[PDB]
RNA sequence: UCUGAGAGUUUGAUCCUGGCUCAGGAUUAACGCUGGCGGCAUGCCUAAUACAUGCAAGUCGAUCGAAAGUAGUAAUACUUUAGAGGCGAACGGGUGAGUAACACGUAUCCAAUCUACCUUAUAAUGGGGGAUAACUAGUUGAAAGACUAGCUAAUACCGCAUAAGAACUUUGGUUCGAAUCAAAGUUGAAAGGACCUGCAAGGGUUCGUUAUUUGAUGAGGGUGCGCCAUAUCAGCUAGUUGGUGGGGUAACGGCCUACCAAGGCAAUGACGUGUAGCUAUGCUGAGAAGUAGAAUAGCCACAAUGGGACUGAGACACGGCCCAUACUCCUACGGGAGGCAGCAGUAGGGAAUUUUUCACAAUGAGCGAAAGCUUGAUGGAGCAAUGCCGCGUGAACGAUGAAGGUCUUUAAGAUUGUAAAGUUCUUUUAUUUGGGAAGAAUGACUUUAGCAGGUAAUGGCUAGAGUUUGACUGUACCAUUUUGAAUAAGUGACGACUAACUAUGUGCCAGCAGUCGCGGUAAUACAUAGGUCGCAAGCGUUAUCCGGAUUUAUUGGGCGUAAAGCAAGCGCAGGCGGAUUGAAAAGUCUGGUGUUAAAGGCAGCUGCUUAACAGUUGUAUGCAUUGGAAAC
RNA sequence: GGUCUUGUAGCUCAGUCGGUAGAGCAACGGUCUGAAGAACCGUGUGUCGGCAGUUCGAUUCUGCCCGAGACCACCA
């Protein structure tokens, strides 16, 4: 192994925790939106979706896709 | 460096640091022979200007090979 | 790097000559311990006295092993000389390469046939001014038994040609000295001062190119084969070219590492217990006990005729006579190669004593040169000794 | 081997004199056939294409002293161009540097020319060579490192030596140029193309 | 050195094999024995041919004669 | 343009038919004898067997705190980083077991996609909070480590307002699944560092950063094409052929799921076995073509085996992680450590594959404004006749032919043989003398000189000055540099096939031999000697390839008696098809456009003394499109 | 390197109580086959790897070695 590898690992534990926490809050908001459909919750959801897509945490394409699927269910409702 | 041992040669070619030397290249620009002196160097400067305009430049010493040539003094106007 | 080691002090090789049960192993441990308590860089060793099975399980010497230790005056190596027969080749292996051999005899284990034969072989091969040390005096304290052995060791040392009246005698107890009884360290200091006096060294000269007698071969994981021996003449630096000689066709080789006791040298020396790593060689072609020289001038031989000093049967010669078909073991500075005593037509049975001039034929082409001292033995008894007078083929 | 060693033996077998006209007339016993004791009469029962090809290959190979690897590679170099391979090959055979200095007449034997050229005493266009088989171009100037002009052997070679029209030379300066290609009539006629280009079934 | 067991012919005068020696095997085609085509190469580190082999010393592993 | 040989082998003898052998090259060659140098190539093909130790991945203090130490009375400046954080850590290297298919290469489409930094162009760089390091202490164990408490920084993290441009959808508008437009909601950007100027207020430059756009770049997918044998291999097959919604990937896509159908592939060869990394190319070849797919360069796979996941922009990651498995190892018994198909290098397997060499000097890459750092890449060094090429191992003179040896076989003589002896001359190399490269004809670097923006001054573009980087090197090389013919040839064969004879020995024994076969008591085939011829620091001898071998005949065979016409008839598909007019060109031919990596070869040139070799210029090939001709 | 083992005719092989050398084959001659094989009779051979003892007495029982054959060298 290399000292740089340990440097990477001790650092990446925290960022792995951050990524899983962000994924959890995205999933919680998605479930809340599917519990009751409104633009109020969707504005928030798209807000943290853009914030996560600001980095490489979530690719912008998958977010555009799910956001289009959500705006579709808004439109038919 | 290709050719013979104790005989250096450097083909001038547009390359990027994401590929190893003497592997795969983009497009030939010329060849430089450091083995024998008195300014052995031939260039095309036909699409090399476009490559400079779009990044992914070749190695840094090549810059100097166009300082004596004078491309730098005429590139800035193209740059701005 | 391999823990480079260097030293500028003279190096005198000293061994514990004498039969087992004389406290010789305990003496080797005790000298190391006392110089650990007397000099720096003298790490203790009791489980490192020997390196093979049954070598330590018995407590008395059987096979070879090397130890290294320095005093505030001089550096010393030591090889563990064997006891009982069927291993005498190792002792002479040591006996050829020491210049100092402390006679570690025991007052309670007074000179035994193995010890007397060890002294006689030291006379035959040449051990200059070898010193004596009475040992294991912790048992059987007597008014005159401690002194009859002291006079008889002088008598036996003067009974072969050495100087038994020009050697100081210091007694001691092996177990008491090793355990750490304070009064027994003065005697080991006296012994060290005794090997400081009248004990010469292999002469220091770099002009001689190369020659070494191999003692053992050890293959090292990754490096290759580091073959060890003792230099008779020459100095050695890493990167030099050499040629192997003895029982095999002469082949060139290159040195890549020189060591004392698995610690890398800077400059080898004649008499130093050296170990040299060799490239491109395996144990199959490099033989345990071969010789080596500078490339260009060395010749192996089979037949040669020399003046042999026939030792008298009362002095230790052969028990009986011999014909042309007699086949004793010749000892050449590194190896027991067994030849035949091809008697020139002097008499039908040459007797021990009355030194003769004989030609001999050997099965193996070994390096020979005029004037080189060689030994003649047979099954634990020396039957002759001399130097080469004429090399034929 | 780089050289023939003995020469008169081969010329006896070659049936041709590498010298001008004479190599031996009365040497204790003169013969116009193969040397040795077996040569009572063996030249009238070996008529075959194989024998002729080998004999002529030895004749021209011994005529100049080129090893078979070099001999092969030089023929391949002659194949490089088309021209007329017959006369082109003959012109290349005489274009060897030792043959050049032999035809300008500074050497009595091609062995002497080879030995002189190897020592670096012959300077070619201000850059000497150690290969005594250099292929030249029309208009090449030579000089011999004028110290070596005082050589008695060179003096006894070059006083009235070989005079040729295709090469201009001066013994008052020991220097010259290569004017043009020699004519076939001016070269030994005991050497033919057909047999060796046949033994050249390799190429 | 593998499990294959093969018949072979020793060339030259005499032999130096003692029923337990390793040596090198060569091909070739002799027509004095059916099947037998392989032969033993002499002078390779074990069995060696040293019988005034002045000419054709390449095979048999015979050293060059001494002056 | 290119571009071509045969000979012997059946029988009592001849011919045909077919077979066999030899003769050319060529290695990843090995190996026997031996061996002088140099340039160059090349140096584990076996056990993707395991392997001491070390190097192969660090850099950044102008990203941040703290700490140490040095100097300084001190203030302060300076070196360093344990850490935090940034970038490369995917490339760079080796290997080819596995992998017969989109793997390869080519031609496209990605109207189904991604792409940090590098390019264009532009708006912002405002505000606050929070903790973890480091450190202090304790627990825990021999250790690796692990756990707990108090105290810290930010260009690390998180909210807070702002939103040119961008995010979605909606209305209107435009264009042949899409593109351009106007409008209606909604969302989300952070960070400063260094320096300069300014009393301040602020301003300026650079770096850094958010956002947006242009590219290029590489990545991902699909596509026909051609590239193993195998019918003494015949059915295969169900997210499998599909359709319906959702999840899902950057993205289409049963990729996957809930549901509903039953197809699809296959006799033009599925499936099955064995084998294979692929291509350019290497070799044979004249040529259709064959062989190998050394090295080498492009593509793919892979990292002790098998999985899982994080991060990075991109990984399931040659020197990341976790786990299981197997091995090895420490172990005080409780726990743990590791992965040379990275450089070597060792064990072993072989017939065999190189040193724990030097320097990052060049170059290149990675890091960082900057000094500078790393590079077992790379550029060198050593070993090896493993291969190609160059050169010495003297030359000139020198006859009845010295000695000797052999034959004739005594008693002339011939033969080795100008070969010897003897005489001179010369020193590539060998031995000495002195000098000595280029590669450093790139580059920072601070001062000069000029130059774009704007000026208040920095900074940036170009020339001049030098510091300058050399392991190789006192090397290549240079010179009426001393001495010295001195320091240096072996080696297969002689019956013929194919140049190369006498003597002695053996007597179908001994032996040789690729072929015919020689030898059983004068052997041109065996043994030896001499002579001889062949190649030469090389000579031979075995494996694999091709020519020969037309010896599966595309070119370039036939099938009455030497080998074969099914025992014969009917006949599907398919192949080959009457004449004349028209259509287009699917073929066919041909013009243009692009590719056909470099490299290989060919033709020409240049350089190393010429060489070998390298580099330079042009040279094909196949398709894709477009445009013509319409004979077949 | 130690642990043992082996040495018989020319070759491959057993060895009398230390007291004796035993088979087959190549191998010398004869019968016989047009010839050569095959078959049948008689021959032969060893101073038992070499030195010195113990020894009336040694291939044989020892001490010496040599040529050769097998058992392993851990640890960590």
Short mmCIF file of C-alpha atoms in Angstrom, two decimals, chain D residues 15-135:
data_model
loop_
_atom_site.label_atom_id
_atom_site.label_comp_id
_atom_site.label_asym_id
_atom_site.label_seq_id
_atom_site.Cartn_x
_atom_site.Cartn_y
_atom_site.Cartn_z
CA UNK D 15 43.51 -21.90 -64.76
CA UNK D 16 43.74 -18.11 -64.88
CA UNK D 17 46.52 -15.69 -63.91
CA UNK D 18 45.37 -12.85 -61.66
CA UNK D 19 48.62 -11.12 -62.61
CA UNK D 20 49.33 -9.67 -66.05
CA UNK D 21 50.48 -12.81 -67.86
CA UNK D 22 52.74 -14.95 -65.65
CA UNK D 23 52.54 -16.41 -62.16
CA UNK D 24 54.94 -19.37 -62.66
CA UNK D 25 57.03 -20.76 -65.50
CA UNK D 26 59.80 -22.81 -63.83
CA UNK D 27 59.42 -23.34 -60.07
CA UNK D 28 61.15 -26.71 -59.89
CA UNK D 29 58.15 -28.13 -61.74
CA UNK D 30 55.64 -26.10 -63.74
CA UNK D 31 52.08 -27.25 -64.38
CA UNK D 32 49.02 -25.80 -66.11
CA UNK D 33 46.60 -27.95 -64.09
CA UNK D 34 45.46 -28.46 -60.50
CA UNK D 35 48.27 -28.66 -57.91
CA UNK D 36 48.95 -31.61 -55.63
CA UNK D 37 49.69 -35.23 -56.42
CA UNK D 38 46.18 -36.25 -57.49
CA UNK D 39 46.53 -33.97 -60.51
CA UNK D 40 47.82 -36.59 -62.95
CA UNK D 41 44.93 -36.17 -65.38
CA UNK D 42 41.65 -34.93 -63.89
CA UNK D 43 40.19 -32.18 -66.05
CA UNK D 44 38.51 -34.17 -68.85
CA UNK D 45 35.72 -36.02 -67.00
CA UNK D 46 34.13 -33.26 -64.87
CA UNK D 47 32.19 -31.41 -67.57
CA UNK D 48 28.97 -30.33 -65.84
CA UNK D 49 26.98 -27.16 -65.21
CA UNK D 50 27.47 -27.45 -61.44
CA UNK D 51 31.25 -27.73 -61.82
CA UNK D 52 31.45 -24.82 -64.28
CA UNK D 53 29.35 -22.58 -62.02
CA UNK D 54 31.46 -23.40 -58.96
CA UNK D 55 34.73 -23.00 -60.87
CA UNK D 56 33.81 -19.59 -62.28
CA UNK D 57 32.39 -18.46 -58.94
CA UNK D 58 35.76 -19.28 -57.39
CA UNK D 59 37.56 -17.58 -60.29
CA UNK D 60 35.81 -14.23 -59.85
CA UNK D 61 35.63 -14.54 -56.06
CA UNK D 62 39.37 -15.25 -55.88
CA UNK D 63 39.97 -12.54 -58.49
CA UNK D 64 38.91 -9.86 -55.98
CA UNK D 65 38.65 -11.53 -52.56
CA UNK D 66 35.08 -10.99 -51.37
CA UNK D 67 33.57 -13.31 -48.77
CA UNK D 68 30.41 -15.18 -49.72
CA UNK D 69 28.15 -13.20 -47.38
CA UNK D 70 29.59 -9.95 -48.74
CA UNK D 71 29.62 -11.41 -52.26
CA UNK D 72 25.89 -12.20 -51.99
CA UNK D 73 24.99 -8.82 -50.48
CA UNK D 74 26.93 -7.00 -53.20
CA UNK D 75 25.00 -8.88 -55.88
CA UNK D 76 21.76 -7.93 -54.12
CA UNK D 77 22.90 -4.30 -54.14
CA UNK D 78 23.50 -4.70 -57.88
CA UNK D 79 19.96 -6.09 -58.19
CA UNK D 80 18.76 -2.88 -56.53
CA UNK D 81 18.99 -1.11 -59.92
CA UNK D 82 17.83 -2.50 -63.26
CA UNK D 83 20.19 -1.10 -65.93
CA UNK D 84 21.94 -4.04 -67.59
CA UNK D 85 22.73 -6.40 -64.71
CA UNK D 86 25.55 -8.10 -66.64
CA UNK D 87 27.70 -5.06 -67.38
CA UNK D 88 26.45 -3.40 -64.18
CA UNK D 89 27.71 -6.33 -62.11
CA UNK D 90 31.08 -6.30 -63.90
CA UNK D 91 31.38 -2.54 -63.34
CA UNK D 92 30.56 -3.01 -59.64
CA UNK D 93 33.15 -5.80 -59.38
CA UNK D 94 35.87 -3.47 -60.69
CA UNK D 95 34.49 -0.53 -58.69
CA UNK D 96 35.91 -1.94 -55.44
CA UNK D 97 38.40 0.46 -53.86
CA UNK D 98 41.24 -2.07 -53.93
CA UNK D 99 40.52 -2.69 -57.62
CA UNK D 100 40.42 1.09 -58.13
CA UNK D 101 43.88 1.60 -56.66
CA UNK D 102 45.13 -1.48 -58.53
CA UNK D 103 43.97 -0.01 -61.85
CA UNK D 104 45.53 3.35 -61.11
CA UNK D 105 48.70 1.32 -60.52
CA UNK D 106 49.87 2.11 -56.99
CA UNK D 107 49.77 -1.52 -55.95
CA UNK D 108 51.54 -4.54 -57.45
CA UNK D 109 49.03 -7.01 -56.00
CA UNK D 110 45.46 -6.63 -54.79
CA UNK D 111 46.58 -8.16 -51.48
CA UNK D 112 49.05 -5.29 -51.08
CA UNK D 113 46.31 -2.81 -51.99
CA UNK D 114 44.01 -4.33 -49.36
CA UNK D 115 46.74 -4.24 -46.71
CA UNK D 116 47.58 -0.61 -47.52
CA UNK D 117 43.93 0.51 -47.52
CA UNK D 118 43.14 -1.23 -44.24
CA UNK D 119 45.86 0.66 -42.35
CA UNK D 120 44.04 3.92 -43.15
CA UNK D 121 46.93 5.30 -45.22
CA UNK D 122 44.68 5.97 -48.25
CA UNK D 123 42.62 9.16 -47.89
CA UNK D 124 39.39 9.30 -49.91
CA UNK D 125 37.90 12.76 -50.50
CA UNK D 126 39.34 14.04 -47.19
CA UNK D 127 37.83 11.08 -45.28
CA UNK D 128 39.67 7.77 -45.19
CA UNK D 129 38.05 4.34 -44.88
CA UNK D 130 38.97 0.99 -43.36
CA UNK D 131 36.77 -1.07 -45.72
CA UNK D 132 38.85 -2.09 -48.79
CA UNK D 133 35.82 -2.52 -51.06
CA UNK D 134 34.38 1.02 -51.38
CA UNK D 135 32.00 1.61 -54.31
#
